[PDB]
Amino acid sequence: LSFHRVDQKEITQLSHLGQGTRTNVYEGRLRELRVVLKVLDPSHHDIALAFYETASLMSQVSHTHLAFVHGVCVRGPENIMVTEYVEHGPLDVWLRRERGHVPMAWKMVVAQQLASALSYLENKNLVHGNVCGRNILLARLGLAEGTSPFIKLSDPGVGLGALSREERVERIPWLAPECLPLSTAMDKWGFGATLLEICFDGEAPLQSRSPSEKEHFYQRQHRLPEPSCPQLATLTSQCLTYEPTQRPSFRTILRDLTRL
Ligand SMILES: Nc1ncnc2c1ncn2[C@@H]1O[C@H](COP(=O)(O)OP(=O)(O)OP(O)(O)=S)[C@@H](O)[C@H]1O
Ligand SMILES: [Mg+2]
């Protein structure tokens, strides 16, 4: 309910960027700010409500590493979330294109930035539910001498609670295992999975596997792979622990990363 209604006349739709979860995403302009326009598919009212819920919740938080949500445009039957365009796009796509050339120090800066934003959300007691490399956007590349990367975590889109089992399974291994059959504990697991994804240059474990085989992995409660670095491995394994209450707080995660 508490979100800004963007007028259709204030937005200009440019190029199609990709399909998202129940969406098509376009570059746009907001009268001018550079934005993305997330056009909801024709949906049951409960999906639209979950879409509105995200826009409302995201409009009331602020963080240097959270992408802005400008509001929602209702254009006839259409529902369009209007969010900040982040210059260099998704981290996973970028890492895959740049693989082999990204130092561990760079990855540790990015990790700390993400842990900072999630520590703030944990404090606000706000569930994200879609922490993954595709949703970490690069505002600054930080490869050049004297530079440092700068990320922004985007909104979760249609809230996890409204999605089907099939699309929850597709979100494995970022999806917390307790969510397969809503606590901020789930974002600790997504963080851990995103750290693995980053360490492996944008390739998450279990992505060459079928949906039924991802589901089976969780049902057997197999442990996800560890990175080579034992301190980093200690943190990822702690985050990627099946019992949610055994996952460390983001205050603790943040402290551990700062020493790395
Ligand atoms: N904030 C942004 N800035 C720049 N490009 C973006 C942004 N958000 C999305 N994109 C682009 O749009 C494409 C589709 O984005 P997705 O994140 O897959 O869509 P989505 O509607 O947010 O669905 P999710 O993340 O499953 S809830 C991405 O591959 C990016 O290239
Ligand atoms: Mg997204």
Q: Which of 39, 7, 13 is nearest to 24 (CA)?
A: 39
- State the Cα–Cα distance between residues 252 and 222, nearest whole angstrom: 25
Nearest residue by C-alpha to atom 2 in ligand 1: 85
What are the residue ranges spanned by the domains of the chain? 1-85, 86-260
Within 8 A by CB and 6+ apart from 208, the residues are: none
Method: X-ray
From the CB of 83, is ligand 1 less than 6 Å away? yes
Q: Which of 210, 240, 214, 213 is nearest to 225 (CA)?
A: 240
Domain 86-260 in the same topology as domain 1-85: no
For residues 221 and 192, the answer to whether their CB atoms sit within 8 Å is no
* CA 186 remoteness from chain centre: 12
Task: Give me the phi and psi of 81, to 5 degrees please.
Answer: -80, 135
| Rg of the chain in Å (alpha carbons) | 18
Backbone angle region of 71, left / alpha / beta, with phi > 0 → left and psi within -120 to 50 → alpha: left
For residues 102 and 201, the answer to whether their CB atoms sit within 8 Å is yes
Nearest residue by C-alpha to atom 28 in ligand 1: 18
Strand pairing report for 11-20 and 78-84: unpaired
Strand pairing report for 69-75 and 5-6: parallel
The class that CATH gives domain 86-260 is: mainly alpha
From the CB of 69, is ligand 1 less than 6 Å away? no
From the CB of 202, is ligand 1 less than 6 Å away? no
51 Cα–ligand 1 center, Å: 14
CATH of span 1-85: 3.30.200.20
- State the Cα–Cα distance between residues 129 and 158, nearest whole angstrom: 10
The reported resolution of this PDB entry, expressed in Å, is: 1.9
